[PDB]
């Protein structure tokens, strides 16, 4: 039912866009002015909360994948529940990445005069907060994912043979590598944006 | 068939890999394996080593006339050559960064004109002459790989296979394609432009000689009307003349299956006047290959030592190691894809254009 | 295999730096260019002798 | 400046506080309950110790809660798209947080408390992970009660 | 100005509530699936 | 792999624990050198079997015993693994249990054409086989009377689709043909429900180990239909299952293959199977090539699979303790390194 | 000024998105898979772990092929200079083709390098051709950073 | 302005989604922990009276979905603000969608305890002690809808 | 009015396409093939460097849109024709959608190939030839757009 | 208006499409022709060069795809009607969504035909025989988007 | 007003569409019936030319669209009306939509008959008789479209 739905929505578009292009009014489908004529908090606002969620939405699912396997493993050799808990710490790192970044994004996020309100500025630093939330969350989701399944194969791989988490561990490091290089882009991303004024 | 293979593999080779830089290495290191011919002959040899030496001698020629169609092209690593006397002068007057052209002094003796370089519309012309050069390939080893039909049914003493099968696929090659080729260069014979006459294109010249026959929207030559109708009518009456010819007269010679020799001939029919039309467009692989090496020679020098050429710093040891870098970075690139893994692609396409586009002929 | 990387790099790289010491067209002819072609010249040529000075040592090898 | 539409994304704000949070809390106590319904059938003496991850998912909630009823103490019919894009932002940050932290403990918590009736020595073990997946939720309230505290300057 | 229908601000309240009703059917299709381990339930 | 641990995290770290518990080949070595049951007793308790033995005493210990209770908690960590399954991994749990069900029936329905008692025909049958109606198959004797009586409220009962009942109540002939059939379904069913509704790690990994069963199967009818069968191809062509590797052109040869060089020139024809009915023991080169395909399903992680390359390693260790142990009691020790250890 | 309107740095911080989002995407995915095949032959053999961690470097230098291109976008991004459309749409095209770029790379380094790793443990010849085919897979990513460095000097 | 036409659309739609979500989610909780209690109280039915705890508290869902929607019918009108309008649909929603994930948890959690607690009948006390903190989920979502709805038309113009 | 300022995101995204699809197909053929490479090397490890064909085979239709699109990138401008981003789009579709296919093809003929060619020595000359066959497609759409983006930029005006 | 600036679009995208699902029919009957090719000539190698004809027959139809993109191709212009990109994107669509059936014809009839005439070499020229009928397919696409790019700049004005 | 400038448009997607869908009808009918043919006569070839009959009647529904795509072809003008156009479409949808039902309900029967009149030999007649009624669904739509056509420039103005 949802391939239905994809397909009438796609269809939906195609014959609006057709329709709209045909008469003579293509233009009227205007995306920049929808860029220019939204308002800049939107763009702010969404970012910074889809930066703390989507880095705690990763976080959350690497502790579960490689907290589900600890605790499944343990069974047998319980000698991994806390010398293994580094790598429920190192996809836990991805949302305080995520967190010092949204605080840092709302630090940007004051009262613009409606004078200048859809200005150069104060439209940049909306659409600069937007993106580098987004790129900072969704690489936080995924680098707490990555170091959630390496640190599910190294859970089981410990309790095999106690030389193997030293092998392995090496695979969690260039794994949290990816939520690191996320906190350095969300931050040059937004480094030359100003306050809202 | 390995007797006309051992100019035309490597020269079909050649067609899709044009430089003299990368023929030259090819050459080199194929000279090498000819001259130690005798050092690598008793030697064990693995599969890799052993299918590069087996072809010591199908290498030689393919670096040999990569050497002479990259001569042909401006085209070593991708740079021209100012050997000759150019066609086309420059302007000498005019503002910088502005879009000029070329007047028309002559024509360049041997190759292609140098001055097609870092043109802009260098490339359409490019395009042109490689697709036509491909088409006109394509026909001259298709009509001599037929003629070898010929030549077997005449040493069989078949005169049934010879009124069957060779002069209706003769008369309905040439009709079409032969004449697509003959227009290629009669188009190149006219002027167009000291004529005042529009130039006729050929695409919609062979739509319009099967779809609207007498029809003739850009006149290519006198009489073109009424003997466009004669070619098509030479073409058609051998779709019936080729399908019912022979076994209509092997069944005349018994007054044997009637059925597995009128299956045979529909199906020989349906397949020949196919590949007729899917082989000429299938030799412009010829140009597809010759495209993809040029650009790549070009993209790949524009990457990698453009970058290294500077006026600033002139011996400093940072701007010559930047040159030494760049340039170990460029061979092992150039090496790597554009002859190892470039011309392999390249030697493979012009084998399946033996195997296949002349080896059913 | 240094040994034939370096002998290109004597060959290739010298024939640069002559195109580039006789403001030869298809190196200097263009805006983009570099201006001054026996300024850069100087920095393929000395290239040139290093990759000489590697195909000599690897040349004994 | 301040539009008619602005109130829509503060009350969906204080809606989506408490609805993601719920689904999260809803998820964390039904799948975690579902293994102390089953580890309690052959050693019932456990029952008391393994409701740790109802509890944590119980806390969640509560911390949606919060953002819920301090959203809607700042809603009027004439606030700014400021203030109501800072009250959105304050939702989805515990919402998506509330609702991460929740799938987490409940899929943390049965296979805890299953692994707990087993080996005695994985009680600590899956309390020392389910802290980790609690705290979660603490970081989308951070930033929920800091953008509430620029919702009105 | 951008449309009269689909003016500045519905299309931005149609935008926060499809991410929001996208996470919604996120979480409803995670809760949807769950389901009981009924072996450890029975007494066989 | 990602979404995975969801219902199954718990349950995949415990059968990789009980996979370190699979004996390696120094365990079976240290086993090869005892000299009693008693010492094999004893030097399977430092190993993951751990006081298994214990309410035996040394008197009552025989090599069937043993096999009973090493298999026994097989079959009780099969069931904790399958009481927290939930879904479609415990649908798969369930899935593997029906081929032990079909044994069940095809060994309690030849338990009553010899008149042996219910008691003792029973004791004999599989634990992990069992259905609450298993014992009331001891109520007739046709066919139709135990389906439309008994096998109808079972999961056996979509596989009774080829089952003809020409009206002939049963003898030992033609139970081996329901037999066959039933595993016959019961392979396509399972094969089906495997490339449905499994993931797609434990899928590809999930239909070689089922096709290798196919294919023995496939092997072993066409092998056991030489000596105590007569019997049309036409016929035997129902019996061979239509999943595996070797189906679509070796066995329609091994259909109609009436001598053993008909089997052996179409199994010659297959690339993994020829050389298995040249030399050697043809179930050890079953056995073997089991295990192998058996190991390489626990170097995939995130699979559903490791349950059954669990499971079928631990009745192969099982096998390999019952060989040794009859070994060491009957005091023949030609062949006691004859076991099959790839852990 | 019409050739740089101001929502045109929309498209620039797209491009620094869609150049890190999708190229650590292809990295996770190419070390998360492939480190599945490692530890998988974990207890068998555990000492060909070590040398197998190619495939795991190979696809961390994905995401230093994407970092490098969300660096040198970042960089051309100011509130005070202007910034044509032509760039922002410059800019999200050569993120683009790195992210996608850098997903089928990793995608193709993960599919490889666990099932070589794992098929390794029996055939110790196996490691050259290996490494052959993640280096035919990792210039993938290498081709679309150098069309983003092309693309992004063209378009400023 | 502040009042427009198209306002009352929010508030009918949030008259009704939490009824329409809390009998989902009452249904939900009744339905599948119902199927528990006719399951297992075929063998034991002397405790028949003590597993319709689950029914119960799912129940108490749908009630909290009629207070939210008794309370926001009687503050309906024509000229309502947009405001009121959009409280309401908050309102509504508050309810609705954390009562489909109270009964969703209760209805998970009573039939996987009246199932175990026929078997042990020690996990009784803890089936009631889960349920509890299953439905303050569908009690925190009616707190937060009434307060939006003491704040719904407050200060409106 | 004919070479509006929103010209040059056709040209963008086509100048994408061109990598981003035919990467994927690349990277479908590469790793298909590669599985079974390492999976028939193991009890063949002679043939491990006669397999790499159809990995090689699968990287020059990348290197087929790496040529592509950075001879479209060398004709994006600012003041750009809406033909020039029609036409570069296409171009960019011609190849990324062809090479995808290519790919697709390739992965799917090369590890049957190299699973059939470890069996039989002599089914190699005809992986080879399936693999030309299967080639060609992404020959045939770098054909397309090099045809094709040579027409950008002749007859343009305004 | 008659010839209005987003005309050469479906222009653009009629010469991509003719050749992408094209391509990417006749990718399908490579591959999936082609693994039944190299599962069968592991006993019957001797039919190598004899059951490669579905294989030719999907690449025949990548020809047909060819010939109508550059007849689509040599047909643009920045200033053309919009009745010739109708006409151009109407002869792309009827190649490329025909060639994509005749592709899949073959595919899923040639795997079944090389298979089958191992077991049986008189099913060879029924194979031919089906597989003409799924190969014409693709000709009468070619067909009628020749009988289109005929009539588009035939009488156009403006 | 009555021709507008997109009036083509939708003449040209018939005029696809009239071979696109019989195309795939054709290639279902040819397809499924090749693989049982290939399938049914590994044992007895004798009756590979006369099991040709699926394949013949689901090509003849693409001869069918490739009347109408042809018809339509030569009635496209740039200044043509708009309900020429429609006519256009709507004969080309007319022919592909039935003639793709068509092509499945011939791949259907096609396969299903030659699996089975290898052992009845006198099932072929069936086969036959039922693929009529099969064919005469592309029949119904050629002659919807044919009618179709002959009205999309009758009185147009």
């Keep these: ?197 | ?361 | ?61 | ?153 | ?44 | 792999g990602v979404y995975f641990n969801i219902d199954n995290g718990f349950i995949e770290g415990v059968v990789r624990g009980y996979r370190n518990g699979l004996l390696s080949n120094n365990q079976y070595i240290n086993l090869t050198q005892c000299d009693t049951l008693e010492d094999l007793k004893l030097q399977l308790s430092s190993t993951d079997y751990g006081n298994f033995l214990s309410s035996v005493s040394s008197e009552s210990l025989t090599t069937s015993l043993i096999q009973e209770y090493a298999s026994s908690k097989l079959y009780h960590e099969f069931n904790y693994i399958r009481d927290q399954s939930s879904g479609s991994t415990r649908k798969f749990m369930d899935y593997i249990t029906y081929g032990y069900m079909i044994d069940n029936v095809a060994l309690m329905i030849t338990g009553t054409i010899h008149d042996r008692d219910k008691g003792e025909i029973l004791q004999r049958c599989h634990p992990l086989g069992w259905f609450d109606t298993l014992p009331t198959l001891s109520v007739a004797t046709d066919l139709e009377s135990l389906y439309e009586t008994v096998l109808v409220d079972t999961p056996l009962a979509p596989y009774f689709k080829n089952c003809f009942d020409t009206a002939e109540e049963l003898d030992d002939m033609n139970i081996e043909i329901i037999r066959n059939k039933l595993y016959k379904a019961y392979l396509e069913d399972f094969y089906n429900f495997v490339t449905e509704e499994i993931p797609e790690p434990a899928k590809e990994c999930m239909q070689t180990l089922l096709g290798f069963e196919a294919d023995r199967r496939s092997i072993n009818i066409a092998l056991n239909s030489l000596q105590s069968s007569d019997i049309d191809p036409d016929l035997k062509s129902d019996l061979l299952p239509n999943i595996g590797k070797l189906y679509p052109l070796a066995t329609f040869h091994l259909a109609q293959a009436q001598d053993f060089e008909g089997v052996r020139a179409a199994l010659a024809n297959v690339y993994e199977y020829r050389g298995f009915l040249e030399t050697g023991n043809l179930e050890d080169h079953f056995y073997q090539l089991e295990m192998e395909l058996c190991r390489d399903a626990f170097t995939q992680q995130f699979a559903i699979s490791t349950v059954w390359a669990w499971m079928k390693s631990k009745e192969q260790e099982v096998r390999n303790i019952t060989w040794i142990a009859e070994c060491i009691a009957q005091n023949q020790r030609e062949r006691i390194n004859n076991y099959i250890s790839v852990y | ?156």
């Design chain 2, 1 to 361: 068939a390995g007797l006309a293979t051992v100019v035309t593999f490597p020269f079909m080779f050649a067609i899709m890999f044009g430089d003299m830089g990368h023929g030259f290495i090819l050459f080199l290191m194929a000279l090498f394996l000819v001259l130690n011919e005798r050092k690598f002959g008793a030697m064990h040899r693995d599969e890799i080593f052993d299918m590069a030496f087996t072809g010591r001698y199908v290498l030689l020629l393919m670096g040999a006339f990569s050497v002479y169609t990259g001569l042909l092209y401006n085209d070593i690593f991708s740079k021209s050559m100012t050997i000759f006397k150019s066609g086309w002068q420059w302007p000498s007057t005019f503002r910088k960064g502005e879009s000029i052209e070329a007047k028309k002094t002559g024509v360049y003796p041997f190759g292609l004109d140098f001055a097609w370089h870092g043109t802009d519309n260098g490339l359409l012309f490019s395009n042109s002459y490689k697709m036509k050069l491909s088409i006109l390939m394509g026909y001259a080893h298709m009509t001599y790989s037929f003629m070898f039909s010929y030549i077997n049914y005449r040493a069989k003493n078949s005169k049934v296979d010879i009124i069957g099968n060779f002069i209706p696929g003769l008369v309905f090659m040439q009709s079409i394609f032969g004449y697509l080729s003959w227009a290629i260069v009669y188009k190149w014979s006219k002027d167009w432009i000291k004529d005042d006459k529009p130039a006729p294109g050929l695409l919609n010249m062979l739509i319009n000689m099967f779809l609207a026959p007498g029809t003739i929207d850009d006149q290519l030559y006198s009489g073109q009307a009424k003997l466009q109708v004669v070619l098509l009518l030479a073409a058609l009456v051998c779709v019936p003349w080729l399908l019912l010819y022979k076994p209509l007269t092997l069944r005349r010679l018994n007054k044997f299956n009637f059925g597995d020799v009128m299956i045979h001939q529909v199906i020989h029919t349906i397949e020949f006047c196919l590949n007729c039309i899917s082989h000429t467009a299938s030799y412009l692989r010829l140009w597809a290959l010759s495209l993809a090496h040029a650009q790549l020679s070009s993209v790949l020098w524009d990457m990698t030592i453009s970058n290294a050429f500077s006026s600033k710093n002139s011996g400093s040891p940072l701007a010559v190691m930047k040159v030494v870098f760049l340039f170990a970075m460029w061979f092992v690139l150039t090496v790597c894809i554009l002859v190892f893994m470039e011309g392999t692609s390249a030697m493979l396409h012009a084998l399946r254009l033996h195997w296949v586009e002349a080896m059913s002929k």
């Design chain 7, 1 to 156: 000024n019409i050739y740089a309107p101001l929502y045109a740095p929309f498209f620039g911080f797209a491009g620094c998105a869609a150049a890190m989002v999708l190229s650590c995407l292809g990295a996770a995915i190419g070390t998360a898979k492939s480190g599945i095949g490692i530890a998988g032959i974990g207890t068998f053999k555990p000492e060909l772990i070590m040398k197998s961690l190619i495939p795991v470097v190979m696809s961390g230098i994905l995401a230093i092929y994407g970092l490098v291109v969300a660096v040198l976008i970042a960089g051309n991004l100011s509130p005070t200079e202007d910034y044509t459309l032509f760039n922002g749409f410059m800019h999200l095209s050569c993120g683009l083709c790195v992210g996608f770029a850098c997903l089928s790379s990793g995608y193709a380094i993960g599919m490889v390098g666990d099932v070589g790793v794992r098929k390794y443990m029996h055939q110790p010849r196996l490691f050259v051709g290996i490494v052959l085919i993640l280096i035919f897979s990792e210039v993938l990513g290498l081709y679309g950073m150098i069309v983003a460095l092309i693309l992004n000097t063209r378009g400023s």
């Design chain 4, 1 to 153: 400046l301040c539009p008619v539409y602005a109130p829509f994304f503060g009350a969906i704000g204080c809606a989506s506080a408490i609805i993601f949070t719920s689904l999260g809390a809803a998820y964390g106590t039904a799948k975690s309950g579902v293994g102390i319904c089953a580890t309690c059938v052959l050693r019932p003496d456990l029952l008391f110790k393994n409701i740790v991850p109802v509890i944590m998912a119980g806390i969640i909630a509560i911390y949606g809660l919060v953002v819920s009823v301090l959203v809607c103490y700042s809603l009027g019919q004439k606030q700014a798209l400021y203030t109501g894009f800072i009250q959105l932002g304050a939702g989805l940050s515990v919402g998506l947080s509330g609702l991460a932290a929740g799938f987490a403990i409940g899929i943390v918590g049965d296979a805890g408390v299953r692994g707990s009736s087993q080996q005695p020595r994985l009680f600590v073990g899956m309390i020392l992970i389910l802290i980790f997946a609690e705290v979660l939720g603490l970081y989308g309230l951070i930033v929920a009660l800091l953008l509430n505290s620029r919702a009105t300057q």
């Design chain 1, 1 to 197: 039912f949802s391939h239905f739905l994809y397909y009438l929505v796609l269809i939906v578009v195609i014959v609006y866009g057709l329709y709209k292009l045909f008469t003579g009014h293509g233009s009227d489908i205007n995306f920049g002015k929808f860029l220019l004529r939204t308002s800049p908090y939107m763009w702010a606002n969404l970012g910074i909360a889809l930066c703390v969620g989507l880095s705690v939405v990763g976080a959350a699912w690497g502790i579960f994948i490689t907290g589900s396997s600890m605790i499944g493993a343990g069974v047998r050799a319980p000698r991994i529940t806390t010398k293994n808990l580094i790598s429920i710490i190192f996809c836990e790192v991805v949302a305080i990445y995520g967190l010092i970044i949204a605080i840092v994004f709302s630090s940007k996020l004051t009262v613009a005069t409606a004078e200048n309100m859809y200005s150069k500025s104060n439209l940049y630093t909306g659409y600069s907060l937007f993106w580098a939330g987004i790129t900072v969350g969704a690489s936080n989701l995924i680098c707490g994912i990555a170091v959630g399944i390496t640190g599910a194969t190294a859970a089981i791989s410990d309790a095999a043979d106690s030389a193997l988490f030293v092998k392995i561990l090496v695979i969690e490091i260039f794994g949290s590598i990816l939520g690191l290089l996320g906190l350095i882009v969300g931050l040059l991303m937004a480094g030359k944006a100003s306050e809202f004024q």
């Design chain 5, 1 to 44: 100005i951008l449309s009269s229908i689909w003016t500045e601000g519905l299309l931005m309240c149609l935008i926060v509530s499809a991410l929001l009703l996208f996470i919604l059917i996120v979480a409803l299709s995670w809760i949807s699936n769950l389901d009981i381990t009924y072996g450890a339930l029975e007494k066989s």
């Design chain 3, 1 to 61: 295999c240094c040994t034939v990387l370096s002998a290109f790099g004597v060959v290739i790289l010298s024939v640069i730096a002559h195109l580039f010491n006789t403001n030869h067209e298809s190196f200097v002819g263009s805006i983009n260019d570099p201006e001054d072609g026996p300024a850069v010249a100087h920095t393929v040529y000395l290239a040139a002798l290093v990759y000489l000075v590697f195909f000599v040592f690897c040349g004994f090898q």
